[PDB]
Every structure is written in C-alpha cells, then in structure tokens.
Amino acid sequence: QKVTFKEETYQLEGKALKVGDKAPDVKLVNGDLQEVNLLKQGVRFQVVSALPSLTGSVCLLQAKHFNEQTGKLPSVSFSVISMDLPFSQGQIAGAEGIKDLRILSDFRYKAFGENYGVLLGKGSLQGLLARSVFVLDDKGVVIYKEIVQNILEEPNYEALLKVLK
Numbered sequence: 233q234k235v236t237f238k239e240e241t242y243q244l245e246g247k248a249l250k251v252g253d254k255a256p257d258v259k260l261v262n263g264d265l266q267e268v269n270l271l272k273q274g275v276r277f278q279v280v281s282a283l284p285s286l287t288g289s290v291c292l293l294q295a296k297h298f299n300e301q302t303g304k305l306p307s308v309s310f311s312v313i314s315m316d317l318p319f320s321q322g323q324i325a326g327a328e329g330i331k332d333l334r335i336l337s338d339f340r341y342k343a344f345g346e347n348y349g350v351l352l353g354k355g356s357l358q359g360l361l362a363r364s365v366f367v368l369d370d371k372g373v374v375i376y377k378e379i380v381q382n383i384l385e386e387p388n389y390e391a392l393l394k395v396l397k
C-alpha cells in the first residue's frame with residue numbers, strides 16, 4: 233500500500249501488520265518521560281491510532297475525536313502515537329484540554345512505526361507515522377486496520393465505531 237500527500241507518494245516502511253495478526257507489544261514514551269508498553273491487559277477493545285504530528289490541524293481533529301471517545305467508551309482503551317517529543321505532545325494536549333487521551337511518543341525506538349508498518353518512507357514526511365487506526369480484540373488480535381490513503385483526510389470514524397459496537 234502507498235500513502236499520498238499532495239504531489240508526494242510514500243512507501244510504508246516497517247513490518248506489514250494484517251487483520252488477523254497478533255499485534256506486537258512495543259516500547260513508547262509518555263508525557264512523564266516514562267517508558268510504557270503499548271498493549272493493555274484485560275480490555276474488550278484496544279484502539280491504536282498514529283499521525284504525523286499533533287502540530288497539524290487534521291492531526292489535532294483526530295486527537296480531539298479520540299479524546300471524546302475515551303470518555304464515551306471507558307470499556308475501550310484509546311492510544312494516539314506520533315514522533316513528536318513527549319514535551320510538545322504534553323504542551324499541545326494541555327492547550328487543547330485533551331487530558332484523558334493516552335498520548336505516546338515513538339521518538340526513542342520508532343518501535344511502533346517499524347512493527348505496525350506505518351513509518352513514512354522517502355519524502356518531506358520521511359520518518360513520521362502514517363495516519364492510521366488499528367483495533368485489537370481482547371486477545372490482542374488486529375480485527376480492523378485503516379492506513380489513510382490521502383494523509384490530508386481524517387480517519388474513517390464510522391467504519392471504526394461499527395467495529396466497537
């Protein structure tokens with residue numbers, strides 16, 4: 233699969249993760265500069281979304297939409313991942329009041345990008361994460377995957393909420 237950004241077409245780098253595959257656990261860094269494991273034990277659904285940067289308008293709308301679901305669906309674990317340092321993630325989350333959302337940084341190991349196959353290849357956005365959504369079931373198996381073809385588009389929220397119902 234390819235991703236488009238205006239005139240640029242990106243190859244996706246890292247390991248291809250498919251619907252039906254066991255999702256790999258990866259090390260990320262949270263707002264307190266604490267290393268955390270992506271996967272949560274004993275929750276019905278885990279939603280893991282990635283975006284190029286929280287600095288961007290489309291990116292912030294995605295973060296705002298997952299912050300709202302965090303409160304509406306407490307039985308579902310929501311995580312948003314970017315290559316932004318935890319400091320900027322905390323600053324932007326603070327200003328926008330997105331305090332319930334689990335915001336994690338892939339900067340240290342690029343372990344999410346490499347293991348979920350959403351690392352953007354050569355181009356202006358190279359090394360940033362493709363806009364993407366994975367839903368895992370209670371076994372940690374991928375039951376839904378969207379890598380957004382046009383990175384200027386928001387994720388398909390309707391397709392996603394049908395998976396969580």
Ligand SMILES: *c1nc(COCC#C)n(C)c1N
Binds near residue numbers: 284287289383384
């Ligand atoms: C996330 N999405 C986008 C696309 O447009 C938003 C803007 C600006 N960007 C730039 C990020 N960072």
